[PDB]
Amino acid sequence: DIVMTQSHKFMSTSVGDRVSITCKASQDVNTALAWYQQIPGQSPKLLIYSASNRYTGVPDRFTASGSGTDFTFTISSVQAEDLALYYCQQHYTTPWTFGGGTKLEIKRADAAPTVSIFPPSSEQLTSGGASVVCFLNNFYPKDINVKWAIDGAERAGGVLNSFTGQDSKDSTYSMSSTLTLTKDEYERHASYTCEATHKTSTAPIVKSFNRGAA
């Protein structure tokens, strides 16, 4: 199996600027390579066929080059609607393999996340459930590390994370982290901490609370 590698899951760019996504085939697939673009909830769109040919209807801003083992997709001047996923795919020898994709994102001013932590509601506790929710909103860059601490020790079991793609309006990211325990275990601990590590502060952002303590 040939392996298409797109070393950059994400690439920061700006509207009106030039950007180049790279692809590296594990083997010489000659010129049998295609580039696709994909927007959320839609199917891929062919942009480049046979290494460096624009498909019909594909605007002059899109270009591709390479032939052999290294290929590169380029956008002369990025437009708002170009901030999507771009996939690499070799069709030299079966099985056809796709690269892992590269998502172009808008670069903006660094923004610290606003962190909020929430204890389990009384209604959930009555059902025998205990979820501690932590919101980390409107931050940039997307690079962030969320850790949960229970009575001091880090907890990795029972954590479910969810996040939104870059906002189309303020170019930030947001995330939700939920620690879900049973009421039994929740009541056997006292200290619950949500800890956010982001480049915007030397010290990680920390939010906590003590069971039964205001």
Binding site: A34, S116, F118, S131, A214
Partner: protein, 220 residues
């Protein structure tokens, strides 16, 4: 006007298989081979195999050995995707065809068919109000409230704040599996406006015909 119409999404149980459909149109169906591609959130796009309606039958990807034995049928110009075992096969499946004669690149794609494998049955969500500890209203000029929705199936649920009148400063996150889809939403307003001016999350779950409007109140 080449067009590939895929089938609506389906929710098979962790055990059986499902035959997907793709209705080609706008071109002589038998002149091009049909391809199928899989797309999971963590593994990206993976080619499954092709089929010649003129009949050259198939050729599958090593990885989709017998779990994917394609099939087609002329006189209707539709291609089918069997899906055998099914359990980790939860994802979106695409129907793909090439453009020019000499380039295996896929110029034409179907809208995709979502497939979710789960043993769970339709289940209404529990909705839990998230308010800052000890009521109050934070310690700054802004306060964040929340709504936790969990234990439901299948997707989706719609969530709004104050019947939609509260839309700014809202963050509603993608639901994550776990037996009963669970998702949450946060809303951030001016500290002095809560609990002065009530805030309620409205959660609706079509599948169960259920709705829950949970008001967020100070708590101890």
């Amino acid at each position: 006007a080449v067009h590939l119409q895929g089938t609506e999404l389906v929710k098979p149980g962790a055990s059986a298989g499902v035959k997907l459909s793709c209705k080609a149109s706008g071109y002589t169906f038998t002149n091009y081979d049909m391809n199928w591609v899989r797309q999971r959130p963590e593994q990206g796009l993976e080619w499954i195999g092709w089929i010649f309606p003129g009949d050259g039958s198939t050729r599958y990807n090593e990885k989709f050995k017998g779990k994917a034995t394609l099939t087609t049928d002329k006189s209707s110009s539709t291609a089918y995707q069997l899906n055998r075992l099914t359990s980790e096969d939860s994802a979106v499946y695409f129907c793909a065809r090439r453009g020019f004669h000499g380039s295996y690149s896929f110029a034409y794609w179907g809208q995709g068919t979502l497939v979710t494998v789960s043993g769970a049955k339709t289940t209404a969500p529990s909705v839990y109000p998230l308010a800052p500890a000890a009521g109050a209203a934070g310690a700054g000029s802004s306060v964040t409230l929340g709504c936790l929705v969990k234990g439901y199936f299948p997707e989706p649920v719609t969530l709004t704040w104050n019947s939609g009148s509260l839309s700014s400063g809202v963050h509603t996150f993608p639901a994550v599996l776990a037996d009963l889809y669970t998702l949450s939403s946060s809303v951030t307003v001016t500290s002095s406006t809560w609990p002065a001016e009530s805030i309620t999350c409205n959660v609706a779950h079509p599948a169960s015909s259920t709705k829950v409007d949970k008001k967020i109140e100070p708590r101890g």
